[PDB]
Amino acid sequence: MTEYKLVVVGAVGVGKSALTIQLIQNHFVDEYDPTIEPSYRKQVVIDGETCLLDILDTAGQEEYSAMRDQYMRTGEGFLCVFAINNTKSFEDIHHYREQIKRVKDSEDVPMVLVGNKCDLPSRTVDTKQAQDLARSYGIPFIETSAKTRQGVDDAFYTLVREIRK
Ligand SMILES: Nc1nc2c(ncn2[C@@H]2O[C@H](COP(=O)(O)OP(=O)(O)O)[C@@H](O)[C@H]2O)c(=O)[nH]1
């Protein structure tokens, strides 16, 4: 089966780790078990095809430029995550996309825009604003909640579909 190297990027606090843990372990913070050490290699079936997701989370190294570049060289596809209640995290998406294009030396890198924490009421980034940004980038946009699991599989699966294109 094919393996897909997926990298989760985005500002500190947007929920990169929470999203990955929902995909891998199927729960949120209340069910966090510190005795369990999960694997970020997961076998899944996407559109009837079985494959392996190999996930890298940049959490803790967001501001570590040399390591950011290593993630971007390695990754086949990128989840570009912001939080819908953090406009600065949305603005940071520009810088992540730019750096990915530069490290890859390409303008057509598999990428999905993810607006996380859509379960929260206090939104500061409109769904239409994120849709327009993704449109300008030529990439999909998905709203997610690591808390309710809304859109979590869809975000990762859609990224795999982008790589498959
Ligand atoms: N309500 C809500 N909280 C979230 C969601 N995703 C993450 N969080 C919370 O946001 C905080 C930061 O999440 P984390 O994954 O550690 O952020 P990061 O690794 O810095 O990107 C954590 O305390 C999470 O509980 C979400 O979808 N909904």
Author numbering: 1 to 165
Text lifted from the article:
Lastly, we sought to identify a Ras mutant that would stabilize the protein in the “open” conformation trapped by our miniproteins. Such a mutant would facilitate biochemical studies of this conformational state and could be used as a target for small-molecule or fragment-based screening programs to identify molecules that engage it. Upon inspection of the Ras-miniprotein structures, we hypothesized that the open state might be stabilized by destabilizing the intact β-sheet of the “closed” state via insertion of a proline into β-strand 2, thereby mimicking the strand displacement that occurs upon miniprotein binding. We subsequently found that insertion of a proline in place of Asp-38 afforded a Ras mutant that could be solubly expressed but appeared to exist exclusively in the open state. The effector domain of KRas(G12V) exists in two conformational states that each possess distinct 31P NMR shifts for the γ-phosphate of the bound nucleotide, referred to as open or state 1, which cannot bind effector proteins, and closed or “state 2,” which is capable of binding effector proteins and possesses a larger upfield 31P shift. Whereas KRas(G12V) exhibits a roughly 2:1 ratio of state 1:state 2, KRas(G12V,D38P) has no apparent state 2 population, and whereas KRas(G12V) can bind both the 225 peptides and Raf RBD, KRas(G12V,D38P) can only bind the 225 peptides. We were unable to crystallize KRas(G12V,D38P) bound to GppNHp because of hydrolysis of the nucleotide analog under crystallization conditions; nevertheless, we determined the structure of KRas(G12V,D38P) bound to GDP, and this structure revealed Ras in an open conformation with a disengaged switch I loop. In summary, these data indicate that the D38P mutant stabilizes Ras in the open conformation that is observed in our Ras-miniprotein crystal structures.
The Ras proteins are master regulators of cell proliferation and survival that transduce growth stimuli emanating from cell-surface receptors to cytoplasmic kinases responsible for orchestrating a comprehensive cell division program. Ras proteins are cytosolic, membrane-bound GTPases that bind guanine nucleotides and are regulated by their nucleotide state: guanosine triphosphate (GTP)–bound Ras adopts a conformation that binds Ras effector proteins with high affinity, leading to their activation and downstream signaling, whereas guanosine diphosphate (GDP)–bound Ras adopts a conformation that cannot bind effectors and thus is inactive. Here, we report our initial findings on an alternative approach, one that exploits directed evolution to discover miniproteins having extraordinarily high affinity for the most functionally relevant surface of Ras, the effector domain. High-resolution crystal structures demonstrate that the miniproteins bind Ras as a dimer and interact via a distinct binding mode that captures the Ras effector domain in an open conformational state, which can be stabilized by insertion of a proline at Asp-38 in Ras.
